[PDB]
């Protein structure tokens, strides 16, 4: 399971995307059956009031309705749910870009495996208590696994970079969505004026229409806009965390303060980035792995193993 490598912002955006998809599905269902426009001709033909007679059949009324729905209504009011569905599917597909890559997922599985193994390894806690047999053999095997992982992962540079690409893509898509939604959210209005030229068919050329689902689509548009705004603040803070502190280098000086050992080489590049990930998840794993990263700790372990 890679949910351990998933931070809180990723799962927050996941539930936000699920809510966005639900909003899009609801809007599409509204558009399928409840979406209709009602058009009445303009300039027809204690007091008493008499109704204005338009002299129009039901079929002329339906023709006016759909002729003004196709033309007079703004395209945003007609295709807002479909745009929401498309954008939320792109968001969901992009949300696990950094998760779905084959080599990246292999590196993530290897990293979570070694970190869980050293967390389950008694020698981590034993050495942490000491500074501040069979299990020694397993500790030495885990330490050479640590060295193998250092030689296999640390030299690469794909993880932080491609995470930055994913965050930048999310921020850009958020900005585009917010810009176009704020530009076209005033188009969704209840009463519209339709000026199609069907005078040869219905006798009238100017109609006043109302879009019956304009209020609900406006509320749905504002709800989706606020959801996208929250998504964008999440991605902006993610960008701030990515760029403010260099995740190309992880300083183990806090372990140097806690653990008496000082010959701890600072990890670099993807090792630093993934240790930043797990520190956001649980810093105890990082400070417990740092004593398994020092080669002086390896020399001491070799000395104790030779003594045993």
């Amino acid at each position: 399971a890679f949910r351990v490598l998933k931070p809180w912002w990723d799962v927050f955006t996941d539930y936000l995307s699920v809510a966005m998809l639900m909003i899009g599905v609801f809007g599409c269902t509204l558009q399928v059956m409840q979406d209709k426009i009602i058009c009445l001709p303009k300039r027809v033909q204690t007091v008493e009031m008499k109704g204005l007679k338009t002299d129009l059949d039901l079929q002329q009324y339906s023709f006016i309705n759909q002729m003004c729905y196709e033309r007079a209504l703004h395209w945003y009011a007609k295709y807002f749910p479909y745009l929401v569905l498309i954008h939320t599917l792109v968001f969901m597909l992009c949300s696990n870009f950094w998760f779905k890559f084959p080599g990246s997922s292999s590196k993530i599985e290897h990293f979570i495996s070694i970190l869980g193994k050293c967390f389950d390894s008694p020698w981590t806690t034993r050495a942490l208590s000491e500074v501040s047999k069979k299990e020694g053999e397993q500790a030495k095997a885990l330490f050479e696994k640590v060295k193998k992982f250092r030689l296999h992962v640390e030299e690469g540079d794909i993880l932080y970079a491609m995470y930055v690409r994913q965050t930048v893509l999310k921020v850009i898509k958020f900005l585009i969505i917010i810009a176009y939604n704020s530009a076209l959210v005033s188009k969704v209005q209840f009463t519209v004026d339709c000026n199609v030229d069907i005078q040869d068919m219905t006798g009238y050329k100017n109609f006043s229409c109302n879009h019956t689902m304009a209020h609900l689509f406006s509320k749905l548009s504002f709800c989706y806009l606020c959801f996208v705004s929250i998504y964008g603040l999440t991605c902006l803070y993610t960008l701030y965390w990515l760029f403010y502190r260099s995740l190309r280098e992880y300083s183990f000086e806090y372990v140097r303060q806690e653990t008496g050992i000082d010959d701890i080489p600072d990890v670099k590049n993807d090792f630093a980035f993934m240790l930043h990930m797990i520190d956001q998840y649980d810093p105890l794993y990082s400070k417990r792995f740092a004593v398994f990263l020092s080669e002086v700790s390896e020399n001491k372990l070799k000395q104790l193993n030779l003594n045993n």
Partner: protein, 88 residues
């Protein structure tokens, strides 16, 4: 929202003033539908229009609040580990 016009009005208010005969309004079906839509949008209270959506939103907030610590990973890790060690 089935809307019927007031034939006799007195300053924006219905006056409410041998067999009985039905009142002829001379309104088409589509004029009636237009009146329904306009009065439904304008005069019927927002609570009667958005009550189920408000209820759904409140339930979603309540369910998110109840299940937040199960999905928040910093507490989810502790809860899962505690569950595993307690059953075991």
């Amino acid at each position: 929202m089935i809307c019927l016009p007031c034939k006799w009005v007195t300053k924006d208010s219905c006056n409410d003033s041998t067999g009985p005969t039905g009142i002829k309004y001379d309104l088409d079906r589509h004029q009636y539908n237009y009146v329904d839509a306009v009065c439904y949008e304008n005069r019927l209270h927002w609570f009667a229009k958005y009550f189920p959506y408000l209820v759904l939103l409140h339930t979603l907030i309540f369910l998110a609040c109840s299940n937040f610590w199960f999905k928040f990973p910093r507490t989810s890790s502790k809860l899962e580990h505690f569950v595993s060690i307690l059953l075991k």
